[PDB]
Amino acid sequence: FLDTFEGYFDQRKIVRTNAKSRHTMSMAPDVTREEFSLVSNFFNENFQKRPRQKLFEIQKKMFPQYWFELTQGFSLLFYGVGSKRNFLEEFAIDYLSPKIAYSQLNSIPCLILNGYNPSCNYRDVFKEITDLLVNHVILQIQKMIDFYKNQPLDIKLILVVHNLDGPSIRKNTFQTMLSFLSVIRQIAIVASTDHIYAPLLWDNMKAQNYNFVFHDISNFEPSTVESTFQDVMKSGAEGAKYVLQSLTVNSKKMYKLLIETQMQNMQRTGVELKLFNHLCAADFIASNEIALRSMLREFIEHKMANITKNEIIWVPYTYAELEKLLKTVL
Amino acid sequence: IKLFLSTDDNLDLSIISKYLLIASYICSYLEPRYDASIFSNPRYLQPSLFAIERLLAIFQAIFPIMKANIEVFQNLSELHTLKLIATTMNKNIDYLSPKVRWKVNVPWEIIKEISESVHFNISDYFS
Amino acid sequence: ADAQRSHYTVYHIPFVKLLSGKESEVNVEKRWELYHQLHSHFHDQVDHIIDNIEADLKAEISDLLYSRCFNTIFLLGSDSTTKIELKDESSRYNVLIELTPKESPNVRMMLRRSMYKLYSAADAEENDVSYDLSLVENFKRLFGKDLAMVFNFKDVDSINFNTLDNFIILLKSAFKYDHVKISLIFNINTNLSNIEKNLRQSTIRLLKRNYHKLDVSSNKGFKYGNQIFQSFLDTVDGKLNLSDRFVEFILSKMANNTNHNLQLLTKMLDYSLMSYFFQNAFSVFIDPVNVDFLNDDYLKILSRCPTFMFFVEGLIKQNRGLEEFFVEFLVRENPINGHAKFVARFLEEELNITNFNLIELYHNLLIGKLDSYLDRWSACKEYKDRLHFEPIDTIFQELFTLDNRSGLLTQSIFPSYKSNIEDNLLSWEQVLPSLSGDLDKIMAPVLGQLFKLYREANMTINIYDFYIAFRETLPKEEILNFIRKDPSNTKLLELAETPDAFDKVALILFMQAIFAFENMGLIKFQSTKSYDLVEKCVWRGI
Amino acid sequence: RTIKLWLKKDVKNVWENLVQLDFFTEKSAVGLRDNATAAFYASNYQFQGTMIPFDLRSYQMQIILQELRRIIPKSNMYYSWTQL
Amino acid sequence: SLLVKKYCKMTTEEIIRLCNDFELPREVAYKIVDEYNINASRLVCPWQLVCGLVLNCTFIVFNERRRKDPRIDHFIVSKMCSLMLTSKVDDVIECVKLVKELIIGEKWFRDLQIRYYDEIIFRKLGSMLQTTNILVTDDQYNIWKKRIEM
DNA sequence: AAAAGGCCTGCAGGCAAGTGCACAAACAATACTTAAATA
DNA sequence: TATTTAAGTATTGTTTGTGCACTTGCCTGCAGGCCTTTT
């Protein structure tokens, strides 16, 4: 079974130990950071660019319908497949701000909230609302709810919260701060959810104060803005080359003999403790026997020779990319 | 005689909210390795923690003749406000975090009267 | 730059033309003003009901607050959104202290915050003192009037019970002052049985000396909910009617809510009126003055009515005439809303029946099953034939009604949020138009292809094997030919010359789709310093 | 082989009275801290025993059954249920 | 009547012979037979699904002859009445209105109306100006207006 | 053929390889009250 | 003599920590069952 509740209990069988695979990231080709961005920016502007632009023009006809819902106190909450950053900045500025300012007679200011950034505190967001409208934060909004009730219905501030599923927005301290502001009939709330557990954050007491309106707009956006906030490329192939470059001439010869001995039979377990001292007897590199601790404590700091005494050492690194390191050090 | 025989003590749930507490009691007092043989005393100890997707699978099976829309998640969010289901964090909880698990927080006597109002056999699953 | 920064601040009618783009401009302007008449009239009665809810709530609380123990008042079904106003009696100063679960982290901060509001309220009416229990004892020597503290515990279910138990015992020592009276107010949102097991034996017996119940939920006895549904029917009496499917969807949505179902009902009633004035072009014929504005396009729409097809079918079995037959058939008031008001006012006044809802009473009158609903009380047996009424199926009644059938009201307020993500990702042929044209028609997108292999897998998926499966589906000759179509970028032609070009492009698109799935909640990682195994957390269908 | 059998709603008061009398200690509980540093960090952290109801709290006996048989005379009727 | 019979053991050559009487190609005939194999169970009357699927594809394929001659629609209905041994004209209309709702969201039904997207783009986007399935289609009212004039 | 003497082999005695996951504390640095320079 | 905010106490928050839980590998411990004798 694949769909319905029968598919959940059928796809979670007890897999045997011998039936599992042992494929890691060693057989996969290694890529750098420069070539990762050149291909990403090329596929997001040419692959399926015509169907994406034609679908975006279809959703553009829903612009007057979205403005009709905000004038009645219904907050907007967009969702679907992909990011909605380019769809919110083009509607809440190039359509929502000129229409509101021309129907209640400068433009209407819009506060863009970065919900994808984990460093979005709850004291810096409320500082811009007071300066543009003119726990002390929760008590301040409660004093403005009853005050704005007698005021006429006129949108003065537009709240364009981006990514309503990040780590900063999902906190309970920030959620209740935005739901109390959504009750005001003079503030427009335009959010966008990306996680599949969006209605799980709000309950019955939060849905009545938010008054959100779902709008599916699966544009299949690659999300290039929010992708630059996490470690996408994530023991350091390019980082190990800069360590040996800053070291001395004699320090590079100690690591060259360890790589050639370890990569000789990848089924050799590695280089034993006394085995490394035998290499010095044929090549005058170190001083004596007590000087081994001066070079062993420095290699383990840069993550290049892990210990695994059953002293046999073995660094968790395959021989696919290790062969190219010998050419650079030579 | 009614003033000495006893101490005189001391002195409206939704349909979806009632069925959600029934499926949460099963996922917190039963192993998930044998769930493919029934829907396809452990109650005397502390309940176990489960996942969100593991709860919706049993809830959809025990529901009478429904996909997981926003109405199911709305009743599940309100079930945690009344302290009816415990989690792993008390203050500043993250519902979107994949490491935070959910567990039941109601006794057996409370979950017995709830299943009896919806005409659901809850005592046969643990017999 | 604004694209690389964190957060930055950037500082004639929406009604589109209908009639297949052939509607005149004079009909769109009057449609905006006609909608405002029903929108302002409905909100004027709703605002009066909301103001009346707090009016009776403030009077019922004050009647039980003032008419050596604690005056505990349990407010079952209160979301801590009511403003309690105390009286101004002479020779006695009343202070209302509101405690929130966020501002109460421990016991020391509970007494310090309660003493700050007490000293600030007593000084604003008519020397620095400590913020502790010494101010309550020395309240008569520093002011001369009595003390009557009214504690209002906001959100009792959201506060810790280990801290609330110590606050009640600490306030019990203020009973030996002979001039201090403490009255606690709890806003319970669950049940009275859940708040009893989380307290000690010395706390339950102490508060039971003078405790009273005051249940005031959003639908306490279906009293406040009947006034909201009646206000929506008075503004449409003789203009718009309700269908049998609209009342069913309302009862199915209000039953899910409990603590805030009144605001959810107004959202469904306002959304149904907005779609009628934007989609149905027959909204201009509601007013008795804008009836002569008829054309050839309006007569071709009313002829496709299911109820009108039955009237013309029986006449043959036994353009000038059609215009007079349509105008002279709308003057009837249609007693479909005034009859429900007479029944609701006959059981609550004469029969004294207040445990009834107007929403379920209106659904039985539309389908003709009013006798199957009034017999559940065993009281109006002799008045069964008096309140008997049958619905009259009038012609062209669907053009001026609020009926939900194509899933418009469903995919708006209560949609399938989880099912829409899995359906649009798997069945990508329904969203994308089936019109670099060779690659768009022979290769699936990265977002659509990743969800196909993710569903057809077990709970434990390996990233080393998932990349090989995704690379085997993409063609090799079409990928290399598409990346070489940009001669302006000199860095794109240098990467394609390498033999490992196809193995590097597929790995970049795979890493961009894996991280995009984790932000949405589709996959789940194991350890932090590992990144080798992924799990499943979203199942399509459930 | 008549003792009034008390209901489950009446043993709650007797259960809480034995805890204050130092007889039922919580399982894996530190209790009184040594210095004032550990006493402040323990008050801000909510334990798992406060969220769970009273009928599911793991407790421990301060006196085993072997010691109860020595401090109870033979005249009491509850002496036959202390041997096991 | 053949529509009143419940649980009928239909073979594989019965739907083929019934589709050849309405002049249908082999491309649209195999799609109707394949729809019955996947939906063998969860049904009340097998004749209601076969009759509702054949008549639904007749108006789409023969759409060029119904607009020129209004008598083609009135003739294709009386033919199915003799094969089903029925005399009520309301049973034929009630059968083609139930199977159409179940086939309104498939893949083979979309390509049949294109060769012989404008409505599905408003349901997924949540548009308030979508085509509601309440009123009669404009192409259906023009046929009934010409049937009562002959 | 069948109950009465010996003994064959299915079910599962038993625990340790290893990952799992709830526990507690100082951890990092939140928000806040404090004292002092200023016009 | 009181607005100016620096810097202060009091306090938040999430971080890794490790005590302790759990699974399932393995013959081998052991006992229902087969064989033999006999009217």
From Swiss-Prot, chain A:
GO terms for cellular component: chromosome, telomeric region; DNA replication preinitiation complex; nuclear origin of replication recognition complex; nuclear pre-replicative complex; nucleoplasm; nucleus. Keywords: DNA replication, Nucleus, Phosphoprotein. The keyword Phosphoprotein applies. GO terms for molecular function: chromatin binding; DNA replication origin binding. GO terms for biological process: DNA replication initiation; pre-replicative complex assembly involved in nuclear cell cycle DNA replication; silent mating-type cassette heterochromatin formation; subtelomeric heterochromatin formation. It is found in: Nucleus. It comes from the Eukaryota. Component of the origin recognition complex (ORC) that binds origins of replication. It has a role in both chromosomal replication and mating type transcriptional silencing. Binds to the ARS consensus sequence (ACS) of origins of replication. Component of the origin recognition complex (ORC) composed of at least ORC1, ORC2, ORC3, ORC4, ORC5 and ORC6. Interacts with MCM10 and TAH11. Belongs to the ORC2 family. Present with 1700 molecules/cell in log phase SD medium. This is Origin recognition complex subunit 2. It comes from Saccharomyces cerevisiae (strain ATCC 204508 / S288c). The chain holds residues 239 to 617 of 620 of the full protein.
Swiss-Prot record, chain B:
The gene is ORC5. Component of the origin recognition complex (ORC) that binds origins of replication. It has a role in both chromosomal replication and mating type transcriptional silencing. Binds to the ARS consensus sequence (ACS) of origins of replication. This subunit is a candidate for the mediation of ATP-dependent binding of ORC to origins. May also be a substrate targeting component of a cullin-RING-based E3 ubiquitin-protein ligase complex RTT101(MMS1-ORC5). Present with 768 molecules/cell in log phase SD medium. This is Origin recognition complex subunit 5. Disulfide bonds: none annotated. Belongs to the ORC5 family. Component of the origin recognition complex (ORC) composed of at least ORC1, ORC2, ORC3, ORC4, ORC5 and ORC6. Interacts with ORC6. Component of a cullin-RING ligase (CRL)-like complex composed of at least the cullin RTT101, a linker protein MMS1, and the potential substrate receptor ORC5. Interacts with RTT101 and MMS1. It is found in: Nucleus. It comes from Saccharomyces cerevisiae (strain ATCC 204508 / S288c).
UniProtKB/Swiss-Prot annotation, chain C:
It is found in: Nucleus. GO terms for molecular function: chromatin binding; DNA replication origin binding. InterPro entries: EF_Hand_1_Ca_BS (IPR018247), ORC3 (IPR020795), ORC3_N (IPR045667), ORC_WH_C (IPR040855). The keyword Nucleus applies. Component of the origin recognition complex (ORC) composed of at least ORC1, ORC2, ORC3, ORC4, ORC5 and ORC6. Interacts with ORC6. It comes from Saccharomyces cerevisiae (strain ATCC 204508 / S288c) (Baker's yeast). GO terms for cellular component: DNA replication preinitiation complex; nuclear origin of replication recognition complex; nuclear pre-replicative complex; nucleoplasm; nucleus. Component of the origin recognition complex (ORC) that binds origins of replication. It has a role in both chromosomal replication and mating type transcriptional silencing. Binds to the ARS consensus sequence (ACS) of origins of replication. GO terms for biological process: DNA replication initiation; pre-replicative complex assembly involved in nuclear cell cycle DNA replication; silent mating-type cassette heterochromatin formation. Its main location: nucleus. Belongs to the ORC3 family. This is Origin recognition complex subunit 3. CDD domains: Orc3. Keywords: Acetylation, DNA replication, DNA-binding, Nucleus.
Curated annotation (Swiss-Prot), chain D:
Transmembrane segments: none annotated. It is found in: Nucleus. It comes from the Eukaryota. Belongs to the ORC4 family. Component of the origin recognition complex (ORC) composed of at least ORC1, ORC2, ORC3, ORC4, ORC5 and ORC6. Component of the origin recognition complex (ORC) that binds origins of replication. It has a role in both chromosomal replication and mating type transcriptional silencing. Binds to the ARS consensus sequence (ACS) of origins of replication. Present with 2170 molecules/cell in log phase SD medium. This is Origin recognition complex subunit 4. It comes from Saccharomyces cerevisiae (strain ATCC 204508 / S288c) (Baker's yeast). The chain holds residues 425 to 529 of 529 of the full protein.
